[PDB]
Write an enzyme that holds these catalytic residues in place. Structure first.
Site, PDB file in Angstrom:
ATOM      1  N   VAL A  74       0.829  -1.209   0.000  1.00  0.00           N
ATOM      2  CA  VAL A  74       0.000   0.000   0.000  1.00  0.00           C
ATOM      3  C   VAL A  74       0.865   1.261   0.000  1.00  0.00           C
ATOM      4  O   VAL A  74       1.755   1.406   0.836  1.00  0.00           O
ATOM      5  CB  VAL A  74      -0.947   0.051   1.224  1.00  0.00           C
ATOM      6  N   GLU A  91     -13.017  -3.048   9.061  1.00  0.00           N
ATOM      7  CA  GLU A  91     -12.262  -2.175   9.957  1.00  0.00           C
ATOM      8  C   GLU A  91     -13.164  -1.275  10.808  1.00  0.00           C
ATOM      9  O   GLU A  91     -12.699  -0.303  11.402  1.00  0.00           O
ATOM     10  CB  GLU A  91     -11.248  -1.349   9.168  1.00  0.00           C
ATOM     11  N   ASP A 103      -7.845   0.877  12.377  1.00  0.00           N
ATOM     12  CA  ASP A 103      -9.100   1.632  12.362  1.00  0.00           C
ATOM     13  C   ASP A 103     -10.089   0.896  13.241  1.00  0.00           C
ATOM     14  O   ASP A 103     -10.885   1.515  13.959  1.00  0.00           O
ATOM     15  CB  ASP A 103      -9.670   1.749  10.952  1.00  0.00           C
ATOM     16  N   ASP A 139      -0.611   5.704   9.686  1.00  0.00           N
ATOM     17  CA  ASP A 139      -1.357   6.690   8.922  1.00  0.00           C
ATOM     18  C   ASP A 139      -2.451   7.265   9.804  1.00  0.00           C
ATOM     19  O   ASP A 139      -2.361   7.201  11.026  1.00  0.00           O
ATOM     20  CB  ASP A 139      -1.982   6.005   7.722  1.00  0.00           C
ATOM     21  N   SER A 153       4.303   8.999   7.205  1.00  0.00           N
ATOM     22  CA  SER A 153       5.730   9.260   7.369  1.00  0.00           C
ATOM     23  C   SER A 153       6.318   8.462   8.524  1.00  0.00           C
ATOM     24  O   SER A 153       5.642   8.226   9.526  1.00  0.00           O
ATOM     25  CB  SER A 153       5.956  10.754   7.611  1.00  0.00           C
ATOM     26  N   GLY A 155      -8.544  -4.359   8.654  1.00  0.00           N
ATOM     27  CA  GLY A 155      -7.909  -3.082   8.951  1.00  0.00           C
ATOM     28  C   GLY A 155      -7.852  -2.848  10.456  1.00  0.00           C
ATOM     29  O   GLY A 155      -8.531  -1.957  10.994  1.00  0.00           O
ATOM     30  N   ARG A 175      -7.438   2.605  -3.697  1.00  0.00           N
ATOM     31  CA  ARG A 175      -8.289   2.820  -2.530  1.00  0.00           C
ATOM     32  C   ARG A 175      -8.960   4.198  -2.566  1.00  0.00           C
ATOM     33  O   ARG A 175      -8.296   5.238  -2.499  1.00  0.00           O
ATOM     34  CB  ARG A 175      -7.548   2.605  -1.201  1.00  0.00           C
ATOM     35  N   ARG A 206       6.901   9.059  -7.012  1.00  0.00           N
ATOM     36  CA  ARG A 206       8.059   8.168  -6.941  1.00  0.00           C
ATOM     37  C   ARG A 206       7.771   6.896  -6.130  1.00  0.00           C
ATOM     38  O   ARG A 206       8.155   5.796  -6.528  1.00  0.00           O
ATOM     39  CB  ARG A 206       9.287   8.929  -6.430  1.00  0.00           C
ATOM     40  N   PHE A 207       7.076   7.047  -5.009  1.00  0.00           N
ATOM     41  CA  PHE A 207       6.618   5.894  -4.241  1.00  0.00           C
ATOM     42  C   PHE A 207       5.703   4.987  -5.087  1.00  0.00           C
ATOM     43  O   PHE A 207       5.849   3.772  -5.082  1.00  0.00           O
ATOM     44  CB  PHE A 207       5.851   6.360  -3.008  1.00  0.00           C
ATOM     45  N   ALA A 208       4.746   5.579  -5.792  1.00  0.00           N
ATOM     46  CA  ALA A 208       3.794   4.791  -6.578  1.00  0.00           C
ATOM     47  C   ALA A 208       4.494   4.026  -7.701  1.00  0.00           C
ATOM     48  O   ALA A 208       4.139   2.881  -8.015  1.00  0.00           O
ATOM     49  CB  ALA A 208       2.703   5.686  -7.147  1.00  0.00           C
ATOM     50  N   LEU A 209       5.468   4.691  -8.314  1.00  0.00           N
ATOM     51  CA  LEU A 209       6.302   4.087  -9.343  1.00  0.00           C
ATOM     52  C   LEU A 209       7.053   2.870  -8.798  1.00  0.00           C
ATOM     53  O   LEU A 209       6.993   1.785  -9.381  1.00  0.00           O
ATOM     54  CB  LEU A 209       7.284   5.121  -9.898  1.00  0.00           C
ATOM     55  N   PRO A 261       4.672  -2.015   3.908  1.00  0.00           N
ATOM     56  CA  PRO A 261       4.832  -0.574   3.719  1.00  0.00           C
ATOM     57  C   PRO A 261       5.689  -0.182   2.513  1.00  0.00           C
ATOM     58  O   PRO A 261       5.554   0.938   2.018  1.00  0.00           O
ATOM     59  CB  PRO A 261       5.560  -0.133   5.000  1.00  0.00           C
TER      60      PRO A 261
HETATM   61  O1  LIG Z   1      -3.877   1.097   4.633  1.00  0.00           O
HETATM   62  C1  LIG Z   1      -3.378   1.913   5.606  1.00  0.00           C
HETATM   63  O2  LIG Z   1      -4.264   2.250   6.410  1.00  0.00           O
HETATM   64  C2  LIG Z   1      -1.923   2.252   5.610  1.00  0.00           C
HETATM   65  C3  LIG Z   1      -1.180   2.162   6.815  1.00  0.00           C
HETATM   66  C4  LIG Z   1       0.171   2.489   6.888  1.00  0.00           C
HETATM   67  C5  LIG Z   1       0.851   2.929   5.750  1.00  0.00           C
HETATM   68  C6  LIG Z   1       2.209   3.343   5.444  1.00  0.00           C
HETATM   69  C7  LIG Z   1       2.250   3.667   4.098  1.00  0.00           C
HETATM   70  N1  LIG Z   1       0.989   3.481   3.528  1.00  0.00           N
HETATM   71  C8  LIG Z   1       0.104   3.022   4.513  1.00  0.00           C
HETATM   72  C9  LIG Z   1      -1.269   2.678   4.450  1.00  0.00           C
HETATM   73 MG   LIG Z   2      -7.928   1.859   7.813  1.00  0.00          MG
END
Ligand SMILES: O=C(O)c1ccc2cc[nH]c2c1
Ligand SMILES: [Mg+2]
EC number: 2.3.3.9
Length: 704
Positions: A114, A415, A443, A614, A601, A440, A325, A121-124, A524
Site C-alpha cells: 500500500v 475495519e 481503524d 497513517d 511518514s 484493517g 483505494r 516516486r513511491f507509486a512508481l 509498507p
Molecule cells: O492502509 C493503511 O491504512 C496504511 C497504513 C500504513 C501505511 C504506510 C504507508 N501506507 C500506509 C497505508
Molecule cells: Mg484503515
C-alpha cells in the site's frame, strides 16, 4: 468564482480541466454525457449517503445512552444491539459469484503493498515491486545482524555480503529442495532434456520436485538465470560470474530475485493528505499516469521474457497488479460544490473519477487487468446497507462510463465494528463484486474505543493487540471469507506491518498471517514485500485454507467483548507513560499532516522506534486519550502538560516549522489538541473533519 456550472454542480476549474484534457481523451466517453452523469449520480445518491451517516450517529447515541444507564450483561447487550438494528440476522450460507478477476487476486497468495498515490516516486516503485532483489533486502536491513564484522559501511562489506549469500542459499534449500545436497554447495546450473541439473562438487542432482523448475534465460547449457516457482510465486537465481558478487560466489550467483508485491493498492485515503481540488487532481493525475503506463520520474517496468523448461518462450507480468483505494462515505470535498455551496461527497467523486481513469489501464498503453476488471478498495464502511450502497454507486458509475455491469470490483475493508459483527451479510451484499476482505485492525481499534466510549476506561493502546475482541475479529474474518468461498476466488487479507526498520522482527513474527490462512497481508515498502514474500514460500496458504474450512472459531459474544480496563489497573507512572506516548504520536503525525500535506511518514515514537502508520493510528491515540479523559483517568491539565512536553521533542525529532514555544499560535499543535479534547464528539472517532479543516486553515495562512 473559478468554477464550472453543470446542472446543480459547480466544479473547480482545475478538476474540470483535468478531466476534459487528461482523463477523458482515449476512453470514447462523450465529455458532455460524462458531466451530465456526474450531476445525475450526485443528485440521486447524495440523500442515501447522508442518511447512512445519520444512521451511524443515531446508533452511536443509543449505545452511548445504554451504557450510561448501566456489572455487565452480555445477553442483554446483545439483544439490545439486535433491537436497534446494529446487529442484524446472519444470512444462510452462500458462495460468491465475482468473475473476470485476475489470477493475482483469485489464486496467488503473497504480499500486498500500500502506497500514497500523491507520491509519484513511491507509486512508481510500488508498481515496479512485483520483482525485487532478496540480496538488497537482506543487506540493507537488520535481517542480517550488524554483529561484529558484518556492519554496513560506506562501501560493500564482504563479511556481510557472505551472510546475505548464505541466508539466500538456505532459503533455496527450504523452498526448492535439491534431490540430495545443498544449494550452498552448488557450483553450476544447466538445463538438459528440459530438466534443471545442479552441479555439486562430488556429483550432480536435480530438484526433489522438478515441477518447481519454471524456466530460464540464456543458453540451456549455461543459463544466465534459472526460474523456479513455489506455492505459485517465482524465484529467480541470477547467474553472472562476471559481476562483483558473482565473482566471490561458488556458483557465480549474483542475486536471488523474488516475485514480491503481487498486488499494490494506490491509496487516496489514510496515507495521503488531500483537502481540496488541487490535491485531488494531483492524486488523480498520478493514478492516470499509472494506468496509461507513462508515469515517470525512472519509468514503469515491462513484462519479463523466459524460455520454458522445454525450450519454448513465455512471459511473466513485470508489474504489480493495481487496486485503487477510494475514500469512504464520510467526507465531502470542495472539488465540487452544489448551487447552495454545499460540498459534494468525496467517495461519490472518487468512484466516478478513479473509475474513469482506470479505463486506461484496460487498454494497450502508448496496462493493468487483462480480464477487464477495475479494482477499488472501499474503507470505513459500517454494515451491509453501507456495502449495498457502495455497490449501487459502482453500478451507477459503470452506467455513466459505459462499462459492463460489475466491472468495478470491491475490496471490502473489515475495519469497523458494525461491519465485523455483520461480516457475512456485508460480503453477501457484494457477492458479485467482492475481490477481497481485509482486517484493517488499526481503524478497527479506533472504532472499538469510540463505540464503547461510555462503558468505562479502556486498556492501554499496546494491550489492545492481544485483547479477546481483536483475536476473535481476526479469526472471524478468515472464517467468513472461506465460508463465502474465497478460496480460489478472492483474497483474505490481514494488516500492515508499521515498524519499517524492524525487518528481522517482521520476518520473525509476520509469518503468523499466512499461517492464519490469509492469502495476502500489507507491507509498507518494496523492501518489506520482498522479505514478507519469504513467508509465503514457507507456508502453504492454500493448504492452510483448506484445513480451516467450515470452522467457526469466533462467537458473537467473543466479538462483542469490550476491552475495558480492570479496576485500578495502572500505577501513576504507567498512566503518564501512556499519555506521553499517545500525545507524542499524535503530534508527530499531525505536524507533518497539517504543515506539509504529508499523510504518512516514518515517525519515531517515544521509545524512538520508527513507525510508519497513517490516519488510523491517529484515530486510536486520540480516542484512547479522549476515553481516559472522559472517565477521569487523567485530567485536562495532564493532557495539556503532556502535549507541551512532547511538542519540543517532536520539533527536535524533525523545511520544518517548530510548534514550541508558541503553542496557541501553532495550527498543527491546536489540531492535535482538538483531536483529543473534541475526540468524544467526532463521528465514530474519525479524525478527518478536524485534520481537513486545520490543513485548509494552514494553507490559507501560508497563502497570505
Ligand atoms: O492502509 C493503511 O491504512 C496504511 C497504513 C500504513 C501505511 C504506510 C504507508 N501506507 C500506509 C497505508
Ligand atoms: Mg484503515
Amino acid at each position: 468564482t473559478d468554477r464550472v456550472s453543470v446542472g446543480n454542480l459547480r466544479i473547480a476549474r482545475v478538476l474540470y480541466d483535468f478531466v476534459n484534457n487528461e482523463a477523458l481523451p482515449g476512453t470514447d466517453i462523450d465529455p458532455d454525457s460524462f458531466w451530465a452523469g456526474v450531476d445525475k449520480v450526485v443528485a440521486d445518491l447524495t440523500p442515501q449517503n447522508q442518511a447512512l451517516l445519520n444512521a451511524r450517529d443515531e446508533l452511536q447515541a443509543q449505545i452511548d445512552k445504554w451504557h450510561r444507564r448501566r456489572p455487565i450483561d452480555m445477553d442483554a447487550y446483545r439483544q439490545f444491539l439486535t433491537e436497534i438494528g446494529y446487529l442484524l440476522p446472519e444470512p444462510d450460507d452462500f458462495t460468491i459469484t465475482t468473475s473476470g478477476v485476475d489470477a493475482e487476486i483469485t489464486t496467488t497468495a503473497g504480499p500486498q503493498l500500500v502506497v500514497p498515490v500523491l507520491n509519484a516516486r513511491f507509486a512508481l516503485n510500488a508498481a515496479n515491486a512485483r520483482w525485487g532483489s532478496l540480496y538488497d533486502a537482506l543487506y540493507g536491513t537488520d535481517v542480517i545482524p550488524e554483529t561484529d564484522g558484518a556492519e554496513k559501511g560506506p562501501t560493500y562489506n564482504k563479511v556481510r555480503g557472505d551472510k546475505v549469500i548464505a541466508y539466500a542459499r538456505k532459503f533455496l534449500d527450504d523452498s526448492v529442495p535439491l534431490s540430495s545436497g545443498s544449494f550452498g554447495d552448488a557450483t553450476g546450473f544447466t538445463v538438459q532434456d528440459g530438466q534443471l541439473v545442479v552441479a555439486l562438487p562430488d556429483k550432480s542432482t536435480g530438484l526433489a520436485n522438478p515441477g518447481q523448475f519454471a524456466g530460464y534465460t540464456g543458453a540451456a547449457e549455461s543459463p544466465t538465470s534459472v526460474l523456479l516457482i513455489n506455492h505459485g510465486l517465482h524465484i529467480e537465481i541470477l547467474i553472472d560470474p562476471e559481476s562483483q558478487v558473482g565473482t566471490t560466489d561458488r556458483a557465480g550467483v549474483k542475486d536471488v530475485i523474488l516475485e514480491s508485491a503481487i498486488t499494490t493498492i494506490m491509496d487516496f485515503e489514510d496515507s495521503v493528505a488531500a483537502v481540496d481540488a488541487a490535491d485531488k487532481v494531483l492524486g488523480y493525475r498520478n493514478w492516470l499516469g499509472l494506468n496509461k503506463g507513462d508515469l515517470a520520474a525512472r519509468v514503469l517496468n515491462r513484462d519479463r521474457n523466459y524460455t520454458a523448461p522445454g525450450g519454448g518462450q513465455f512471459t511473466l507480468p513485470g508489474r504489480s497488479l493495481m487496486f485503487v483505494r477510494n475514500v469512504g462515505h464520510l467526507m465531502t470535498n470542495d472539488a465540487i460544490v452544489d448551487t447552495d455551496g454545499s460540498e459534494v461527497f468525496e467517495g461519490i467523486m472518487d468512484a466516478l473519477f478513479t473509475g474513469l481513469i482506470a479505463i486506461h489501464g484496460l487498454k494497450a498503453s502508448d496496462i493493468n487487468s487483462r480480464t477487464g476488471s477495475i479494482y477499488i478498495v472501499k474503507p470505513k464502511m459500517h454494515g451491509p446497507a453501507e456495502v449495498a450502497f457502495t455497490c449501487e454507486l459502482f453500478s451507477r458509475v459503470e452506467d455513466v462510463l459505459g462499462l459492463p455491469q460489475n466491472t468495478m470490483k470491491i475490496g471490502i475493508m473489515d475495519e469497523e465494528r458494525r461491519t465485523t459483527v455483520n461480516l457475512k451479510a456485508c460480503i453477501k451484499a457484494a457477492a458479485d463484486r467482492v475481490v477481497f476482505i481485509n482486517t484493517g485492525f488499526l481503524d478497527r481499534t479506533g472504532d472499538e474505543i469510540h463505540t464503547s466510549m461510555e462503558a468505562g476506561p479502556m486498556v492501554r493502546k499496546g494491550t489492545m493487540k492481544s485483547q479477546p475482541w481483536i483475536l476473535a475479529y481476526e479469526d472471524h474474518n478468515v472464517d467468513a471469507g472461506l465460508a463465502a468461498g474465497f478460496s480460489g476466488r478472492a483474497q483474505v487479507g490481514k494488516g500492515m506491518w508499521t515498524m519499517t526498520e524492524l525487518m528481522a522482527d517482521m520476518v520473525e513474527t509476520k509469518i503468523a498471517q499466512p499461517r492464519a490462512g490469509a492469502s495476502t497481508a500489507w507491507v509498507p515498502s518494496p523492501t518489506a514485500a520482498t522479505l514478507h514474500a519469504l513467508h509465503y514460500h514457507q507456508v502453504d496458504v492454500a493448504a492452510v485454507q483448506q484445513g480451516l474450512a467450515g470452522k467457526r472459531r469466533a462467537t458473537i459474544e467473543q466479538l462483542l467483548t469490550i476491552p475495558l480496563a480492570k479496576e485500578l489497573a495502572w500505577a501513576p507512572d504507567e498512566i503518564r507513560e501512556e499519555v506521553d506516548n499517545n500525545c507524542q504520536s499524535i503530534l508527530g503525525y499531525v505536524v507533518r499532516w497539517v504543515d506539509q500535506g504529508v499523510g504518512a511518514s516514518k515517525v519515531p515514537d517515544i521509545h524512538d522506534v520508527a513507525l510508519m502508520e497513517d490516519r488510523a493510528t491517529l484515530r486510536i491515540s486520540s480516542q484512547l486519550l479522549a476515553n481516559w479523559l472522559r472517565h477521569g483517568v487523567i485530567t485536562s491539565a495532564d493532557v495539556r502538560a503532556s502535549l507541551e512536553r512532547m511538542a519540543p521533542l517532536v520539533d527536535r525529532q524533525n523545511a520544518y516549522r517548530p510548534m514550541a514555544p508558541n503553542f496557541d499560535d501553532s495550527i498543527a499543535f491546536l489540531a492535535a489538541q482538538e483531536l483529543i479534547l473534541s475526540g468524544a464528539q467526532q463521528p465514530n472517532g474519525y479524525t478527518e473533519p478536524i485534520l481537513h479543516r486545520r490543513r485548509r486553515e494552514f494553507k490559507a495562512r501560508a497563502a497570505e
